[PDB]
Amino acid sequence: QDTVTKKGTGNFTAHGDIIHKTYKEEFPNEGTLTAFNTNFNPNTGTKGALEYNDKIDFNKDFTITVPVANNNQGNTTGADGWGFMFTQGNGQDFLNQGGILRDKGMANASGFKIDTAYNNVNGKVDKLDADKTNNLSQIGAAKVGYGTFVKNGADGVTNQVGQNALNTKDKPVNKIIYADNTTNHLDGQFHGQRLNDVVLNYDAATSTITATYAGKTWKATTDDLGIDKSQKYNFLITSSHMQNRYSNGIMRTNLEGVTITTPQAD
Ligand SMILES: [Ca+2]
């Protein structure tokens, strides 16, 4: 099958807390990495998005690949995670309303999240984080989170949709160990603080998105996500760091290896 690919800073628009720089000792194999959440402010928290400049057409196949490197922080102090979000709205709306990583964000937004935080506002826990059976039971110092597709309702409220992870023995099923203390660049164990690909592979014939990350696979249909295949969508890569957290929540990608690949056929 012949495909076309767009990538890199020329094809994404930054919104909010996004910077670019080298990390020579920690990522000597890499060029310019793109960092979210570096504007640290425990009074407000922070957030950022990268918005793809072209529309997503859910009547045709696509594969989206995003290299991510997670903060090496426990789930009560680090960043909220990564939200790979499809929406009729834009990055400006996201800065205004929020995304898919918390309790509520942009109305009708949907997509895949890597949730790296146990979010608790004075004893009120984000609903999906409180799901000890499917999602999350290790809280505090653990660098433990979870993956899942999600859909924001007409009211913005985030709900879990699609399938639980399809190829795992982990308990909870959706678990992701998103970082550890390894600094070795060659070691072949999975290390979520190093760069690892998120792959979103959409099959138009079956209306199904497959998400692969950390060797785990999730699936959701356009019907699960509320996606109208007759309408073109925007795609955003999002991250955020909650207020009242007192160490860095820096989350990084390599934008020149963020690829949006589609058939050359119409
Ligand atoms: Ca969370």
120 SS3 class: strand
Q: Is the N-terminal amide bond of 28 cis, ω within 30° of 0?
A: no
Q: Please tell me the distance between residue 257's alpha carbon and the centre of ligand 1 in angstroms.
A: 26
Q: How many CB atoms neighbour CB 247 within 10 A?
A: 14
Radius of gyration of the chain (CA): 17
Residue that has been written with the tokens 């670019």 in this structure: 20
Please state the φ and ψ torsions of residue 91, each to the nearest 5 degrees: -65, -30
Q: Please tell me the distance between residue 118's alpha carbon and the centre of ligand 1 in angstroms.
A: 5
User: In which element (H, E) is residue 222 found?
Assistant: helix 222-225
Q: Please tell me the distance between residue 145's alpha carbon and the centre of ligand 1 in angstroms.
A: 8
Q: Please tell me the distance between residue 119's alpha carbon and the centre of ligand 1 in angstroms.
A: 5
Spatial CB neighbours of 82, under 8 Å, sequence gap ≥ 6: 66, 68, 101, 113, 114, 116, 198, 237, 238, 239, 251
Q: Which long-range contacts (CB under 8 A, 24 or more apart) does 220-224 make?
A: 220/112, 220/149, 220/161, 220/162, 220/163, 221/162, 222/58, 224/149, 224/151, 224/161, 224/162
Q: What DSSP character marks residue 184?
A: -
Quick one: resolution in A?
1.2
Nearest by Cα to 98 from 37, 156, 35, 13: 156
Q: Please tell me the distance between residue 192's alpha carbon and the centre of ligand 1 in angstroms.
A: 17
How far apart are the C-alpha atoms of 257 and 259, rounded to whole Å?
6
% helix, strand, coil for the chain, step of 5: 10, 40, 50
Q: Please tell me the distance between residue 29's alpha carbon and the centre of ligand 1 in angstroms.
A: 31
